[PDB]
Amino acid sequence: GRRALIVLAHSERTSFNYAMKEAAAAALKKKGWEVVESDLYAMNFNPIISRKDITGKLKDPANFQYPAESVLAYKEGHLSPDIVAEQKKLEAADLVIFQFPLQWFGVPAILKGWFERVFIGEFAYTYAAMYDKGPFRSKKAVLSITTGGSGSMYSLQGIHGDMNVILWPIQSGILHFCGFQVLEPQLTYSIGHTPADARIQILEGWKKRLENIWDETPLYFAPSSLFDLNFQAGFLMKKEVQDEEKNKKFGLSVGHHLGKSIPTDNQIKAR
Template sequence: MAGKQKNALIVFAHQEKTSFNSALKDAAVESLKKTGWNVTVSDLYEMKFNAVLSRDDIIGNPKNLNHFNYSSETMEAWKEGRLSEDIVEEQKKLLCADLVVFQFPFYWFGMPAIMKGWVERVFLPGFAYTFQSMYDNGHFKNKKALLSITTGGTSTMYSPQGINGDINVVLWPLQNGILHFCGFQVLSPQIFWSPGYATPEDRTKMTETWKARLENILQEDPIHFVPNIMFDMTFQGGFMLKKEAKEDNANDHCGLSVGQHLGKALPPNNQYKGAK
C-alpha cells in the first residue's frame, strides 16, 4: 500500500465514555493516525444506531407487497439505491476502509446487540456477499479486519480445559461466520482478559501493547481458513469438502480448522494465535 492513503474504520460499541473499551478505541485512533492512517469511527451508542431490521430499511414500496422478505428486498434496494440513509453511510465507510477494527466488550460470548445489529443491517446481500462470492472469494477480500475485545473471564477460563471453553471455538462464529464469510483477511484478535480485575498499571500495559501492535498491523499474516478451492462450491455438491481434501488430511492428528475438524482434534490456535 506504499503511496496510498491508508483508511481504517473502527466500529465501536460501548455505552460509557469512561470505560476501558473507550480508552482502547482512543488508543487505536492515536496509534493509527501516528503511523499515517486516516481513521473513521462509528461510535454506535453515540450515533444511537438503529440495530433493528425492518421494512424501514428500504425506501419506497417492497417488490412483494404481500410477503416481505428482508434479504431479497434489501438486495434489490441496494442495487437500485433505495436503502435507508443510515445503512448507506455505514456502507460507504466500509468501502473506503483498508482495515476494520471492531472494538467491544464480549457480552454473552458475542457482540453487543447494537453491534450485531450493525452487522445485520450493513453487511447486506449483494453489497457484502453472494453465494457466488463468499469466504476467500468474498467482496472484502482486499480488506483486513480484527476483533478487539474485553472479557469478564480470565484467559484460563477460555482455555481448552477452562469452564468457558476454548476461545478458538467461541470466536469461530464471529471470525469465520461474519468476517471471513464476507471475504475479510481476518487478523488474530486482540483480547484484553478481564481488565475489570486488573490494576491501573496492568491496564496501561494492555493499552500500550495494543498501540504498538497497530503500528505494524499491515505486516501481520491473517488467520488461516480452509480455502474455497478445497470445497465443491456448488449447490449440487452441497458446498462440502472435496474427497481429495479429506484424503490429504487422513493421516493428520488434527482436523483442518475449528469448523472443518472432520471429527478430529482441533488444530491449536486456529482462531487466536495467542491462545494458551
C-alpha cells in the same frame, strides 16, 4: 495514506473500551492513517431489521422477505441512508477494528444489528463469491475484545470452554464469509481486576502492535478451492481433498475439525 474504520460498541466514555479506541486512533493517525469512526451508542444506531430499511416500492408487500427485498433495494439504490453511510465507510476502509466487550459469549446486540442491517447481499457477499473469494478480500479486520472473566476460564480446561470455539462464528461466519483477512484478536481478559500500572502497559502494547499491523500474517481458514461450489454437489469438500486429509491427525480449523483434533489456537494465533 491508507484508511481505517473503528467500530465501537460501549455506551460509557469512562470505560476501558473507550480508552482502547482513543489509543488506536492516536497510534494510527501518527503513522499517517486516515481514521473514521462508528460509535454505535453515540450515533443512537438502530439495530433492528424492519421494512423501514427499504424506502422504495417493495416487490411483494404481502409476503415480505428481508434477504430478497434488501438485495433489490441495494441494486436500485433506495436503502435507508443510515445504512448507506456505513456502507461507504466500509468501502473506503482498508482496515476495520471492532472494539467491544464480550456480552453473553458474543457481540453486543447493537453491534449484531449493525452486521444485520449493513452486510446486505451483493454488497458484502454473493452466493457466487463466498469466503476467500468475497467482496472484501482486499481488506483486513481485527477483533478487540474485553472480558470480565479471567483467561483460565476460557482455556481448554476452563469452566466456560475453549475461546477458539466462541470466536469461530464471528471470525469465520461473519468476517471471513464476506472476504476479510482476519488478524489475531486482541484479547484483554479480566480488565476489572487489573491495577492501574498494568492497564497503562496494555494500552502501550496495543499502540505498539498497531504500528506494523498491516505486515502481520492472518488466521488460517480452509480455502474455498477445497470444496465443490455448486448446489448439486452440496457445497461439500472434494473427494480428492478428503483422501489427502484422511491420514492426518489434525483437522483444518475449528469448524472444519472433520471429527479429529482442532489445531491449537486456530482462531487466536497465526500459524
